Amino acid sequence: GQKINPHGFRLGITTEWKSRWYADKQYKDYVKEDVAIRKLLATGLERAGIADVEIERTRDRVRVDIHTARPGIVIGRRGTEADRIRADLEKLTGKQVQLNILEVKNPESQAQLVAQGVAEQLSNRVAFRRAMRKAIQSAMRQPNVKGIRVQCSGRLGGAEMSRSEFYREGRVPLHTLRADIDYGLYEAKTTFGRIGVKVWIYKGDIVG
Amino acid sequence: PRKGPAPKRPLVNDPVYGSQLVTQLVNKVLLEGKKSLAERIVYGALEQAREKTGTDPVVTLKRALDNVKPALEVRSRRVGGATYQVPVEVRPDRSTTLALRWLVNFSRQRREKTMVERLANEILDASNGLGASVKRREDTHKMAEANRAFAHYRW
RNA sequence: UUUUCU
RNA sequence: CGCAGAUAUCAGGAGGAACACCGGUGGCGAAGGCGGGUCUCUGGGCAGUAACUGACGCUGAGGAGCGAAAGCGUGGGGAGCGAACAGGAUUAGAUACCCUGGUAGUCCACGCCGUAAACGGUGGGUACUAGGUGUGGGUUUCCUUCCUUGGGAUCCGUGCCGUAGCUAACGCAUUAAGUACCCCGCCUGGGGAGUACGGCCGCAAGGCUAAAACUCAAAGGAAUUGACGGGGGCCCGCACAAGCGGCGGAGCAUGUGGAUUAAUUCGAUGCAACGCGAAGAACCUUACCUGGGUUUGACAUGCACAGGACGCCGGCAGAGAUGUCGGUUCCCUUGUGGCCUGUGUGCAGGUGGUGCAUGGCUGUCGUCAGCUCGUGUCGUGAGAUGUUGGGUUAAGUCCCGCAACGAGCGCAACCCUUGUCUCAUGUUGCCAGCACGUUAUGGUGGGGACUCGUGAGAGACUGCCGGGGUCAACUCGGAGGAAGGUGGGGAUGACGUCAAGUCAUCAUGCCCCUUAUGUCCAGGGCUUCACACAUGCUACAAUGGCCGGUACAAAGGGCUGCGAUGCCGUGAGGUGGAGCGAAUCCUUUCAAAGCCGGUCUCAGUUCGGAUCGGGGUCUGCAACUCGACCCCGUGAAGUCGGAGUCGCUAGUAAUCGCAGAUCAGCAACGCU
Ligand SMILES: [Mg+2]
Ligand SMILES: [Mg+2]
Ligand SMILES: [Mg+2]
Ligand SMILES: [Mg+2]
Ligand SMILES: [Mg+2]
Ligand SMILES: [Mg+2]
Ligand SMILES: [Mg+2]
Ligand SMILES: [Mg+2]
Ligand SMILES: [Mg+2]
Ligand SMILES: [Mg+2]
Ligand SMILES: [Mg+2]
Ligand SMILES: [Mg+2]
Ligand SMILES: [Mg+2]
Ligand SMILES: [Mg+2]
Ligand SMILES: [Mg+2]
Numbered sequence A: 001g002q003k004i005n006p007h008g009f010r011l012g013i014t015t016e017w018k019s020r021w022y023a024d025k026q027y028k029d030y031v032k033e034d035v036a037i038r039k040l041l042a043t044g045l046e047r048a049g050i051a052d053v054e055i056e057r058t059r060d061r062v063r064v065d066i067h068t069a070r071p072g073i074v075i076g077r078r079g080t081e082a083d084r085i086r087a088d089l090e091k092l093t094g095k096q097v098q099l100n101i102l103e104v105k106n107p108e109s110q111a112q113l114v115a116q117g118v119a120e121q122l123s124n125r126v127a128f129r130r131a132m133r134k135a136i137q138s139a140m141r142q143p144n145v146k147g148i149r150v151q152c153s154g155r156l157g158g159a160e161m162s163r164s165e166f167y168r169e170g171r172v173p174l175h176t177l178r179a180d181i182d183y184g185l186y187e188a189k190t191t192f193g194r195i196g197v198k199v200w201i202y203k204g205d206i207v208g
Numbered sequence B: 001p002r003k004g005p006a007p008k009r010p011l012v013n014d015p016v017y018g019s020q021l022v023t024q025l026v027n028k029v030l031l032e033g034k035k036s037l038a039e040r041i042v043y044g045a046l047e048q049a050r051e052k053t054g055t056d057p058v059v060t061l062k063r064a065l066d067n068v069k070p071a072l073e074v075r076s077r078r079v080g081g082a083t084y085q086v087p088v089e090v091r092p093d094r095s096t097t098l099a100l101r102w103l104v105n106f107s108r109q110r111r112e113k114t115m116v117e118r119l120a121n122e123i124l125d126a127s128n129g130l131g132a133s134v135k136r137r138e139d140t141h142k143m144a145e146a147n148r149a150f151a152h153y154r155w
Numbered sequence C: 001u002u003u004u005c006u
Numbered sequence D: 001c002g003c004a005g006a007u008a009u010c011a012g013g014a015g016g017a018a019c020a021c022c023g024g025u026g027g028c029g030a031a032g033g034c035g036g037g038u039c040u041c042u043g044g045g046c047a048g049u050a051a052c053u054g055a056c057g058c059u060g061a062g063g064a065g066c067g068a069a070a071g072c073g074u075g076g077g078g079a080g081c082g083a084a085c086a087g088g089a090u091u092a093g094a095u096a097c098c099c100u101g102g103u104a105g106u107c108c109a110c111g112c113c114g115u116a117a118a119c120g121g122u123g124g125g126u127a128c129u130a131g132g133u134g135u136g137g138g139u140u141u142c143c144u145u146c147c148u149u150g151g152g153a154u155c156c157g158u159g160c161c162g163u164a165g166c167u168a169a170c171g172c173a174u175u176a177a178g179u180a181c182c183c184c185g186c187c188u189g190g191g192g193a194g195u196a197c198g199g200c201c202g203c204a205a206g207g208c209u210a211a212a213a214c215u216c217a218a219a220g221g222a223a224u225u226g227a228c229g230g231g232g233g234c235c236c237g238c239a240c241a242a243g244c245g246g247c248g249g250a251g252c253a254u255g256u257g258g259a260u261u262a263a264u265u266c267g268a269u270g271c272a273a274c275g276c277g278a279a280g281a282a283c284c285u286u287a288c289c290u291g292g293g294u295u296u297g298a299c300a301u302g303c304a305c306a307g308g309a310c311g312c313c314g315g316c317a318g319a320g321a322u323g324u325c326g327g328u329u330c331c332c333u334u335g336u337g338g339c340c341u342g343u344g345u346g347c348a349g350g351u352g353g354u355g356c357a358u359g360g361c362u363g364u365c366g367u368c369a370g371c372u373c374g375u376g377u378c379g380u381g382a383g384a385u386g387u388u389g390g391g392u393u394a395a396g397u398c399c400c401g402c403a404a405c406g407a408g409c410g411c412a413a414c415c416c417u418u419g420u421c422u423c424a425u426g427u428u429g430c431c432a433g434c435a436c437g438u439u440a441u442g443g444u445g446g447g448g449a450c451u452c453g454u455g456a457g458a459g460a461c462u463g464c465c466g467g468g469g470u471c472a473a474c475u476c477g478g479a480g481g482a483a484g485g486u487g488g489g490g491a492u493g494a495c496g497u498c499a500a501g502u503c504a505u506c507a508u509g510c511c512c513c514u515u516a517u518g519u520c521c522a523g524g525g526c527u528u529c530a531c532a533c534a535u536g537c538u539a540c541a542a543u544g545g546c547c548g549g550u551a552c553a554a555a556g557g558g559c560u561g562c563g564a565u566g567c568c569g570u571g572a573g574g575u576g577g578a579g580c581g582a583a584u585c586c587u588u589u590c591a592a593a594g595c596c597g598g599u600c601u602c603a604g605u606u607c608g609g610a611u612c613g614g615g616g617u618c619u620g621c622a623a624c625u626c627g628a629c630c631c632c633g634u635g636a637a638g639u640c641g642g643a644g645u646c647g648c649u650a651g652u653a654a655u656c657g658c659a660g661a662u663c664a665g666c667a668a669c670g671c672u
């Protein structure tokens, strides 16, 4: 092992839990249903990037909040994907299920969706060179974000070898706990196999 | 020890009598870290020696340590593909510590059937000059004065 | 002191 | 080699080679080379006058001579040294490096051969081109003592550093590899080859002129970064040194190797695998082997032909799957949704292969401190500076001048715990001070005066002083303080290396089976052994075994689970079951070692307990291969251990205990 994920390392200080609920007796069934529904949603929705999925449970009622790149296909003008998701959850027997859609402010200020875009560009036809160049430029353009580091591992260009290349700009102080790091990870598909992309983003500092 | 001489612990004194030599002896004979057992055994053997000899235990212990403490030792050294021994003077503190060590070593390995009495008897023998400890000191001095020739190395 | 071969 | 008179010392004598102190990067000769002293003959060189000759100058194929050491012929001498050859010692082998002996030779006179890295690896002659700085010889002029490396001018020889220039670079530099002219040899890719034949010379050794076939697609010259050294310098780590206890000899428990078996499922193989993936192998897990069924299938989905059945609770046959029969049967509503029984269609299905294709995760170098980028500058070019030297620190932490100016990952900090104090705070927790208990203890009414458990703040920052320091970093000592010079331990792995582990976690590209390598079940296995290795407990007896009395802690687990009191069992445990989703009830008042009293007087032992037999308890439908616990008989090896090798520097090393993870039952001496 080389590096521990900054999210897990810094859980107790900066980032908060993305799921909050108390139970001990039905805790097994509850965790089973949450992990299930999360996996089913992940495998069902791929067209639209979903940043994070947070679930809060209050007795029988459960509320799920979704962050996505753009709501156009996440929720239809008449509620196509919304009704499909509701029907899915009802089949999974989530009891009373309520849906909310929350929209991110800066599309490329966070790790998940930039990772999705880079994976898509790498997979379809785009070269990793231009992929990294455009991703870094777009991430830089935003003033709030300061440091970005993108790493790609796997087979690149179809060559029969593994290339581990990373490009870095700005802040990457993972040792400093006070710093703010955003971690993302997704796998890019291709004809010859699978490629993993990892990106780190630094966004200011927090005191308090 | 690369940086320099390390600090030395402030060894405590014996309140029963008033000599830290008793503390040193009990610490040396400590087996499996049983302080109460070791100290009670040492006190019992000291009383046995006292009743056997009819004299002062502290005085006879001082006599024994004075008789058995060496002043010259032998150190091993190999130079030019050949092994040699050199004699080097020793600080009296280390001499006393090693004398206690030999006292324990030769109080470990004799066949008197009861070590509580046997350690006292060994102390009497060392005081009288018939002890294995004094025999070992004789041998050490003989070796040192035999290897005196190679003293030119001075290490 | 000496200390072969990949 | 001597004890037949050695080594040692004093006197005397014989004989051969070479000359320390002068003596040097000094002098002389064309180059080889040349120095103990005196005498005889002899060559060359430089400065001045410039009297004389009046172009008489350079060069040089063939040719002639000289020419380091070694070797040969003829004749002498032979002190020391010493090829060849004997022995001694090391090495597996020494025909050597080490040692004791020793024949040519090293010397002399007379003839021979004519070869070297005979290198300044750079021919001779001529005229020109900035200087500084030593050294030898000869003449001149002036401070002027006119002594004096005082100073000035000039010819020749010999060193170092330096511009223009040249040079691929290293480098040259008035003694040019600089600008110019005359003369002579040399060579046109490496091996083949300075070799074959011929010729010349020579007694021989041998030397001088020098070919062709064949074969290769490179051979070599400079310079840059890594890597390496049995190179040097400057420093750090239980690396060594002083100490503690261990492994390797015995019994047992796990993992592997090696051999069998139809199978003992697969992977990992020094550091960096070997109480591993196995936090619980009789069915399951297993995928291994035999056998019996099975089929678009145990399990999902879309397309056509058949439909409202499917789905379920029981009797019968069977090693079991499974086959046949008894009891219920749609919820919607006319289109069918849900579900699936028979035909397939695609296709499911694989712990089958590929970590030399991969994602993710992980171990080591190493918690070592090193590793980079922007601009500039230098060189042509691979590149260099920044990252060099001195001082200091645990650290690329910092200070000083320097073609460097800045920045980055790292280091410290911010996070947890532990060391103190202040405030808030009283129940299921404690009791200062008052009352009730009266043997059961705050048990009960009461109470923050401290811990007790969880919230806020302060406190270590070289804070201050004295000396060293470039007045700076940094260091020693001292006062206050709980802590003094990162207080202690933790969370925390920079770029990269080991094609390191993991398709047996999961997913993933390709090949392979599909009527099987898929799928359900009955029994067996992973626990087999004539041996080996690694990690642990028991020890090998008195610091002790055994018996009776006896006081001191932490933290956590408990719902289909802990389990009180009581009763019966030696004890496994049997009945029963208060208190508990838990500071309350259980895990005993949490003990062991510890202290007192008694036996053993050193034994194969009252230490020590494995192996083998006879009786029971507990969980499980199922204890023979194959679990654990209690009682009895059984009484084996083993007396501190071989070369070798391991951990440990303060609550540290040693020794003795408690709870939990997987779990109905345990392989529990392993792990936390
Ligand atoms: Mg840090
Ligand atoms: Mg003599
Ligand atoms: Mg010469
Ligand atoms: Mg003359
Ligand atoms: Mg004239
Ligand atoms: Mg001649
Ligand atoms: Mg000669
Ligand atoms: Mg000859
Ligand atoms: Mg001759
Ligand atoms: Mg002769
Ligand atoms: Mg002679
Ligand atoms: Mg010999
Ligand atoms: Mg010799
Ligand atoms: Mg000789
Ligand atoms: Mg030659």
Ligand SMILES: [Mg+2]
Pocket (backbone or CB within 6 Å): none
């Ligand atoms: Mg010339």
Ligand SMILES: [Mg+2]
Pocket (backbone or CB within 6 Å): none
């Ligand atoms: Mg000159």
Ligand SMILES: [Mg+2]
Pocket (backbone or CB within 6 Å): none
């Ligand atoms: Mg120049």
Ligand SMILES: [Mg+2]
Pocket (backbone or CB within 6 Å): D167, D177
């Ligand atoms: Mg040239």
Ligand SMILES: [Mg+2]
Pocket (backbone or CB within 6 Å): D169
């Ligand atoms: Mg050049």
Ligand SMILES: [Mg+2]
Pocket (backbone or CB within 6 Å): D173
């Ligand atoms: Mg020069």
Ligand SMILES: [Mg+2]
Pocket (backbone or CB within 6 Å): D175, D176
């Ligand atoms: Mg010249």
Ligand SMILES: [Mg+2]
Pocket (backbone or CB within 6 Å): none
């Ligand atoms: Mg050729």
Ligand SMILES: [Mg+2]
Pocket (backbone or CB within 6 Å): D193
């Ligand atoms: Mg040749």
Ligand SMILES: [Mg+2]
Pocket (backbone or CB within 6 Å): none
């Ligand atoms: Mg020839």
Ligand SMILES: [Mg+2]
Pocket (backbone or CB within 6 Å): none
């Ligand atoms: Mg011939």
Ligand SMILES: [Mg+2]
Pocket (backbone or CB within 6 Å): none
């Ligand atoms: Mg070359």
Ligand SMILES: [Mg+2]
Pocket (backbone or CB within 6 Å): none
């Ligand atoms: Mg070279």
Ligand SMILES: [Mg+2]
Pocket (backbone or CB within 6 Å): D228, D229
């Ligand atoms: Mg080297």
Ligand SMILES: [Mg+2]
Pocket (backbone or CB within 6 Å): none
């Ligand atoms: Mg250390």
Ligand SMILES: [Mg+2]
Pocket (backbone or CB within 6 Å): none
């Ligand atoms: Mg050691």
